[PDB]
Amino acid sequence: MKLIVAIVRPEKLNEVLKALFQAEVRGLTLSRVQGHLHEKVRLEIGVSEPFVKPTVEAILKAARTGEVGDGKIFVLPVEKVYRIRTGEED
Amino acid sequence: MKLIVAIVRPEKLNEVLKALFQAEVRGLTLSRVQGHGMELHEKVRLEIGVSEPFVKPTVEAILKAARTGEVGDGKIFVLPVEKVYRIRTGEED
Amino acid sequence: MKLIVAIVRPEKLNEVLKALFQAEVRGLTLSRVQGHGGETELHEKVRLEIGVSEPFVKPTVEAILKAARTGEVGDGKIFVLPVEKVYRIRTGEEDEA
Ligand SMILES: Nc1ncnc2c1ncn2[C@@H]1O[C@H](COP(=O)(O)OP(=O)(O)O)[C@@H](O)[C@H]1O
Ligand SMILES: Nc1ncnc2c1ncn2[C@@H]1O[C@H](COP(=O)(O)OP(=O)(O)O)[C@@H](O)[C@H]1O
Numbered sequence: 001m002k003l004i005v006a007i008v009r010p011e012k013l014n015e016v017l018k019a020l021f022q023a024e025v026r027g028l029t030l031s032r033v034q035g036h037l038h039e040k041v042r043l044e045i046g047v048s049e050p051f052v053k054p055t056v057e058a059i060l061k062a063a064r065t066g067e068v069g070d071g072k073i074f075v076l077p078v079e080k081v082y083r084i085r086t087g088e089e090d
Numbered sequence: 091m092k093l094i095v096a097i098v099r100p101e102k103l104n105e106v107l108k109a110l111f112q113a114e115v116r117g118l119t120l121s122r123v124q125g126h127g128m129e130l131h132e133k134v135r136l137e138i139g140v141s142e143p144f145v146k147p148t149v150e151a152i153l154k155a156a157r158t159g160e161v162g163d164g165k166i167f168v169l170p171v172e173k174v175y176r177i178r179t180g181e182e183d
Numbered sequence: 184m185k186l187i188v189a190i191v192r193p194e195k196l197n198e199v200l201k202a203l204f205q206a207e208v209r210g211l212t213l214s215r216v217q218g219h220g221g222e223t224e225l226h227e228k229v230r231l232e233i234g235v236s237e238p239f240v241k242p243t244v245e246a247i248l249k250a251a252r253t254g255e256v257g258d259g260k261i262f263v264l265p266v267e268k269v270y271r272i273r274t275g276e277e278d279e280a
């Protein structure tokens with residue numbers, strides 16, 4: 001499992017979410033933040049190893065505008081993930 | 091240390107916070123977020139730094155308190171932390 | 184690469200941003216959160232999220248520690264998280280070392 005944290009332009013959020021959905025990426029969490037200050041959207045997406053590239057690519061393509069300020073995408077290691085509904089791991 | 095990131099239902103937050111307090115967990119950060127399991131749902135994200143010996147007990151407290159058994163309960167991520175510092179003292183841990 | 188997560192007092196934000204820019208740090212993300220320390224109900228804090236290369240880890244941490252300190256309970260904490268890789272959306276450039 002990996003945890004993807006992406007910072008994108010609010011104006012590109014809808015396009016980004018559509019792209020993720022298209023790529024079969026459904027689980028995600030997002031919040032509004034400020035960055036350098038300008039408003040931005042932060043997405044945190046927990047994915048299995050096979051979905052790292054597809055997720056990263058969906059965002060790269062949908063979030064780019066070509067102008068400085070487009071954002072970044074971090075891929076973080078995750079040691080364990082638990083599903084609250086079942087109380088079981090993964 | 092590890093960093094616990096839990097996404098829970100808003101209606102379960104008080105129960106979660108009570109469970110953490112009872113499990114001796116005092117240090118934590120939280121905020122409101124939106125999530126999908128276009129339909130976004132309000133959720134609450136908790137970020138808790140906890141040392142290895144106590145990761146399991148802390149995760150368990152959240153699991154029990156946040157559960158409803160219905161789809162949408164959320165997930166808990168446990169991330170590795172290379173280093174942690176206390177600002178009040180600068181202490182490397 | 185590393186991802187620095189710092190929780191600081193709102194009152195210390197401007198001083199922290201100042202020290203960071205001075206340390207040649209510029210790109211970063213921040214948000215308002217509610218928190219509580221290890222003592223004994225929640226208080227507002229500012230959460231900084233800073234992606235940096237290995238050479239900038241020590242300098243970034245040093246800047247926050249020096250500027251965000253009041254010496255009183257509630258000062259916050261700094262987490263240095265491992266990053267597998269980072270992509271710049273505009274250029275598609277990837278960093279890993
Ligand atoms: N190093 C970083 N750490 C954390 N967040 C960052 C970092 N760099 C950029 N960001 C986030 O992404 C936003 C835009 O980044 P920016 O570097 O301007 O993109 P671009 O590569 O197009 O110039 C920043 O305002 C912030 O929200
Ligand atoms: N893989 C994930 N990555 C990031 N956040 C997630 C992920 N899965 C779920 N979430 C967060 O947990 C909330 C509830 O998700 P979940 O319990 O899986 O409901 P569902 O069963 O419909 O997927 C989501 O709204 C989101 O905030």
Ligand SMILES: Nc1ncnc2c1ncn2[C@@H]1O[C@H](COP(=O)(O)OP(=O)(O)O)[C@@H](O)[C@H]1O
Pocket residue numbers: 116117118119137138139140176177178179190217218219220221222226228255256257258259260
């Ligand atoms: N273990 C933790 N996990 C996540 N956030 C924490 C943790 N401990 C403290 N915080 C954040 O820092 C704030 C408390 O500051 P802290 O440094 O613990 O006080 P003190 O300077 O007395 O050590 C909390 O309100 C929260 O925002």
